[model samples]
Target: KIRPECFELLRVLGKGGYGKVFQVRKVTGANTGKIFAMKVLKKAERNILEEVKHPFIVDLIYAFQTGGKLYLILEYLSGGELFMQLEREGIFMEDTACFYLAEISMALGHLHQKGIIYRDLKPENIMLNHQGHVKLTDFGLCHTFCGTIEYMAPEILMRSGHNRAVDWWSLGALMYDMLTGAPPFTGENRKKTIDKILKCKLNLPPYLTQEARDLLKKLLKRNAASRLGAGPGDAGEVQAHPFFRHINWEELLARKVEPPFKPL
Candidate 1:
């Protein structure tokens, strides 16, 4: 088991609604000389940490309760969030978007297969490790099986019990965000944004290639049953999408993609 005294707190790397993340160095222990991010959340949020435990998902190394607070030790990511990388580079090529989205899709698929629903599925929740690999983090809002409206399927918006299909909508929303730097649906006011999202217009940019546009259409489909590639017995539907034609499914599982881009 890890303890606070085992690591030296470095500095605050980021803060969120749940808690703050700090960079810490492993000072003395089995992981001595290594580094990690320590997240201190209220004890009430312990269930959130317990819900996630996959290699692609950030691990909660240890937890301790003290002084009315709960502390969670996690693997520190140096490369930072995908949004941070995008902010450094104005826009990305289609191939670059495919590479990152492919990995995210795989992760989401895994989560869904296990009956876990990741409520949050944005670039901000995806962190790049030191080796440039993608790791899904942040599970504060993840419920047993549902997600937020921004990425929620139409059936879910209509009160249908949401499941893994929600992640497919999020995948499309993320791709649109990456290509155009904005979600397909948004508004100056929160209410208006919600209105547009429910309509499911999926306004694609004029410059987006037909292939990309088609992929988004399938992914953003409103009907849960008709949603691009999710549901009982819907295996390989996502892989068969034309947008992912160049991907080598087996190699991707082995992390063989060259990664179209990386931090300089």
Candidate 2:
């Protein structure tokens, strides 16, 4: 058993629905001060982390429990968030957005193949490595699902038995955020926002390239069954979209594709 006293909390990293995150280190082990993020979660999620191993997803080093608290030691990502840059520049070009979207699609595909539905896919949850490559975080609330009304899929509001389809819908909303500088749909209040997601049409900007427009339309479809990537091919279906025509999946997965930025 890993003793709690062996680890020392350094500083607060961030927070999510499940827990507060802290930059922690092993004080008693042979590795001594190697850094890691201690995710003091509100409950159990060890099993979900087990089957997941991907270049675009956060890596879990250890899972331990002390009394009623569950602690997960995740590899600390220091590149900050995708939202940070996306915020400073209002909107990102199709080239920049496509690079990220490809990586994220791969990550989502990896999780989906393992039967994990990443119900959350916002920029804040999308972490970047030192190389600026994408690595998704905040998975503790994957299926529990609820962040902003704009990114929410319509099925989550209606039946709530949402499947992998919800993830792709959120991806579309983020794509729109990058391309259009705002969510696809936004209303003044909660009810109106919920009202918008269920029935609103995704208005596309005139300047966006046709491929971007096409993919966005497919992703934001109201019905789960009709949505692109909602079918058997899943993320592969997304990867095949003309929007990602420039991507080389093998190189991208190997981290061989040069990211547009580096955190350092």
Candidate 3:
């Protein structure tokens, strides 16, 4: 049990429809001077955060509520959003993109193992630690039909009732964004973007390798049942792809692989 008095709020990290996330440091405790991110949410949204416990996911250290607001103390990641990094770099090399994709796949795999569907999977929801590894955040949208418009799958957009397969579809779109500057499908506006996602073909750049192309094709299948990770093996089918042939799954899961980039 902890109280707001136990921490010293430093600055705002981010804000959303629920509440704000703040960077805070413990002022009085056995673990003093340590920095953390406090996510202040409504009590109704706190249940999901309480059940999540994974290495590739953001860790919730402490939680408490007061005056209609619920506070979740989490591991503070200094490297910030992968979105900003992508914006700066424009696009990443195959090696760098593969590294991030592999990590995110593992994170999504873990969530599926718990029978949880991470409805949101995008660079904006991905956070990097000081060590440069990924820590997937923003679980408030889980199990819901809503998500970033650009990343939504065909099944999801069709209102056909989706599951974990949607995350793999987003992974394919994410990989395309990493190789290029934007998703495979895009139009002039939100309505057009949704139309493109539903009707447009997946266009891969000429520079991408065959293995990468093949993986994307399999993952972005319009039919959810035919998608790579939609099978009983879940993310295993995607991990076994040749693009990730050299990846040491155990090493990646253990956080032993040196990340391609270290944040400044």
Candidate 4:
């Protein structure tokens, strides 16, 4: 329903050697002047791009392809990737971390309900809209071992036949990174990282609040079956944790809660 000429590439959002994302604006269509993010690649694909929908996840606006390139027009999140903000701030205050983590959990839970397992759940894979709410991105990256290792769960390292619970474990790792300025597990190299994930204790900082400590401990559990979100309650169980006690699910899903930060 669209073509390359319908839009103008305004800025380079990403250029990952083989693929790229361009910030674009519709110039000739009925919804003229609307801005969007267009992802392009010479080779690759996913049908999940079209079916799933959630406020906390990037929205797919349009799809089409040329002789050699595939295009995905998505919602333009001008606030950019969460990784950039994390790099600038080093560490976030507990309250700030709570807001972001709460949003992503809702997003992740939505996907889990749809039978989608987001193997990658790190700062780089999250984007922020103008209001600074989280949008879990990188949908093009399929669920697999291709995910970054630092946030990987122990069952993943063991290749012990994982389930949706892996994503919750990564969520815990992401929470640690947000508040502590480091992932829960890390080593000098890949194997060291894998070994640490399998055998090393999660080194949570002492400064973390009591609820934060408890949630992290439960989430990072090595036994996948014992993981917090793995129960039939799924995300409901994770959300009920004391660390997220302040979140109002109704307000959060409606996006009524004020964001901790707003982007220019």
TM-score versus the correct structure, for each prediction: 0.87, 0.94, 0.94, 0.94
lDDT of candidate 4?
A: 0.85
Q: How many clashes show up in model 4?
A: 0
Q: Flag regions of model 4 displaced more than 4 Å.
A: 44-46, 142-147
Cα lDDT listed for each candidate: 0.73, 0.85, 0.84, 0.85
Q: Compared with the true structure, what per-residue lDDT tens digits does model 2 show for residues 43-79? A: 5256777668899988888888887778888888888
Error of 3 at 67 (Å): 1.4
Model 3 clash number: 0
* Clash pairs for candidate 3: none
Give candidate 3's error at residue 253 in angstroms.
Answer: 1.1
- What tens digits encode model 4's per-residue C-alpha lDDT throughout 1-264? 579999999999987535799999999778899999998877623467676788898888888889798888999998888888888899989888898889898888888888888876779888999889899767665444555788878877777799999998999999999989999888898778888889848787899999999999999988888999999888889999989988998998899999877876
What's the CA RMSD of model 3 in angstroms? 1.9
Candidate 1 lDDT over residue span 70-181, tens digit each? 6788888776888886776667778888888887877777777667666556787788876666788776633423323465455555565777777788888888888888
Candidate 2 segments whose C-alpha is farther than 4 A from its true place: 42-44, 142-146
Show where candidate 3 strays beyond 4 Å: 42-45, 142-147
Q: Which has the higher TM-score value, candidate number 1 or candidate number 2?
A: 2
List model 3 lDDT by residue over 1-264, tens digit each: 579888999999988756889999998778899999998876534565567776688887898888888788999999889888899999999899999999999988988987877665678989998889999878763343344577778777778788999999999988989989998788797778788888748787778999999999998778888999999988899999999998999999888998888897
Each candidate: RMSD to true structure?
3.2, 1.8, 1.9, 1.9
